[PDB]
């Protein structure tokens, strides 16, 4: 019983991780794509506070 | 007669014995069923523990 429950759990502790990876990477992209448009604005705020 | 006394003496012991020995063959059959039962109850408890722990581990990792 334990024998058919250990392999069960193994295949679920693979399924769970597999989905986490897909969100993680898509939400990694969502932090890239959000920045690269509001990118010149950051450089502006930085520049403006180094040169005084 | 003295012999009509004696046959009632065997038939008396040889029913007490056979009721005692079906009160051991009942008792054992009970205690063993309640044993067998509890050894799969304990099996139930183990499986939960090991699955609740495991899911948390794989969540924290992800």
Curated annotation (Swiss-Prot), chain B:
Keyword presence, Ion transport: yes
Highest taxon above the source species: Bacteria
Keywords: ATP synthesis, Hydrogen ion transport, Ion transport, Transport
GO MF term set: ATP binding; proton-transporting ATP synthase activity, rotational mechanism; proton-transporting ATPase activity, rotational mechanism
Signal peptide span: none
GO biological process entries: proton motive force-driven plasma membrane ATP synthesis
Any GO CC annotation of this UniProt entry: proton-transporting two-sector ATPase complex, catalytic domain
Function: Produces ATP from ADP in the presence of a proton gradient across the membrane.
Similarity comment: family membership: Belongs to the V-ATPase E subunit family.
Protein name: V-type ATP synthase subunit E
Organism, scientific name: Thermus thermophilus (strain ATCC 27634 / DSM 579 / HB8)
């Amino acid at each position: 019983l334990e024998a058919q429950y250990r392999e069960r759990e193994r295949a679920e502790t693979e399924a769970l991780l597999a989905r986490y990876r897909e969100r993680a990477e898509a939400e990694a992209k969502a932090v890239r794509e959000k920045a690269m448009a509001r990118l010149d604005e950051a450089v502006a705020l930085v520049l403006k506070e180094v040169l005084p | 007669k003295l012999e009509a006394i004696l046959s009632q003496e065997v038939e008396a012991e040889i029913q007490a014995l056979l009721q005692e020995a079906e009160a051991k063959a009942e008792a054992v059959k009970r205690e063993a069923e309640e044993k067998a039962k509890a050894l799969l109850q304990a099996r139930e408890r183990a499986l939960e523990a090991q699955y609740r722990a495991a899911l948390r581990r794989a969540e924290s990792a992800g």
